[PDB]
Design a protein around this ligand. Sequence first.
Ligand code: ZN
Ligand code: ZN
Ligand code: ZN
Ligand code: ZN
Length: 219
Amino acid sequence: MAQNITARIGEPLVLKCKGAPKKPPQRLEWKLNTGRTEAWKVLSPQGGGPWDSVARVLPNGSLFLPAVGIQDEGIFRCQAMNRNGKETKSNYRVRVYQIPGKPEIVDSASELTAGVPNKVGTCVSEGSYPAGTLSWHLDGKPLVPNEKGVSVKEQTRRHPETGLFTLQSELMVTPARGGDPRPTFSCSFSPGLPRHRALRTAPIQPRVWEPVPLEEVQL
Ligand SMILES: [Zn+2]
Ligand SMILES: [Zn+2]
Ligand SMILES: [Zn+2]
Ligand SMILES: [Zn+2]
C-alpha cells in the first residue's frame, strides 16, 4: 500500500499530497518517520521553514525536500480534506542512494609467481549508499571468490560522519603452471540501489613467473 520512492542523495524531492486542493486554504497534514529520530514529525501548510533545507509544505500541498539525505529515509504520509468533503490519504516509503566514484585497484602486482598464492591488488570503492558490492574478472570472466586458488578478503566501512561507505576487496590468486603469462584482472562495483550499471576499474595485467625447480631429494 505504501508507494516506494527512490531518490539520489543531494537532489530535491517533491511528494504529492493526493486530494489536496491545488492552492490554499487546505486542510492537510504531513507526518514523517525518518532517519534516526524516533518520533513522527508533523508538518502543515506554511510549511515551513527552512532554508537551507529541510522539508516544507508547498502552496499546492506537496512536500518539498531541497536536498535529500540518508536521514530522510523512511515513511512519508499525507492526510488531506478533499474539495469537498472527505479525506484522502498518501503513503510513501522513501529510499536514497549515492553512486560512488569509479572504482580503483591499489597496490597491484607487476608480477605473479605460479604455484604460490599472490596478492593481485586491492579494489577500492569510495562513497556509496547503500554499500553495494565489489567483484573481480580474470580476462573478462567472473572470478568466484571460493574457487580453486582464488580467495578474496573484503571490508565494508561506514563513514560515521556522512553515512557513506568505503568498500575494499583484496584478491589473492595461486596461478597453475602453464598458465597464461599475461592474465588481465579488473574489478566492478555493483550498486545496491538503484537498478544501475556496474562501474569498472581500468584493467591490470601482471606477468606470471614460473620458477623452474629440479631441487628435491629422493627419500
Ligand atoms: Zn524507541
Ligand atoms: Zn595502497
Ligand atoms: Zn562480471
Ligand atoms: Zn547513474
